[PDB]
């Protein structure tokens, strides 16, 4: 895929928000490192229960696939949501 969103993940360990490349494809969602450009973690679209599209932060609810959800800071939150729903529209 080429559709990647620049998001910032707030994890513990440091107060610095980590720049992440949120790869939204017609088949999966991959977390690519912004500087290393490597894929850390990838999810299937079929594991999407819901998502929260806010103008400052975006949250992906993978349900019972892992502990908690995936929340990242980005102004492209709705763009992400729209794109996921777009790819999902192709499968759905």
């Amino acid at each position: 895929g080429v559709s990647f969103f620049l998001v910032k993940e707030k994890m513990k360990g440091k107060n610095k928000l980590v720049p992440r490349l949120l790869g939204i494809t017609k088949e999966c969602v991959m977390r690519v490192d912004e500087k290393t450009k490597e894929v850390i973690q990838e999810w299937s679209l079929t594991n999407i229960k819901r998502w929260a599209a806010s103008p400052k932060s975006f949250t992906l609810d993978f349900g019972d696939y892992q502990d908690g959800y995936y929340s990242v800071q980005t102004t492209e939150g709705e763009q992400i949501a729209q794109l996921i729903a777009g790819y999902i529209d192709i499968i759905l």
Binding site: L45, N47, I48, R50, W51, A52, I88
Partner: peptide, 15 residues
């Protein structure tokens, strides 16, 4: 009754 119309999008391929 707690709605989540805006912000929360309910997808239907969560198997």
């Amino acid at each position: 009754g707690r709605s989540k119309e805006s912000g929360w999008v309910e997808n239907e391929i969560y198997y």
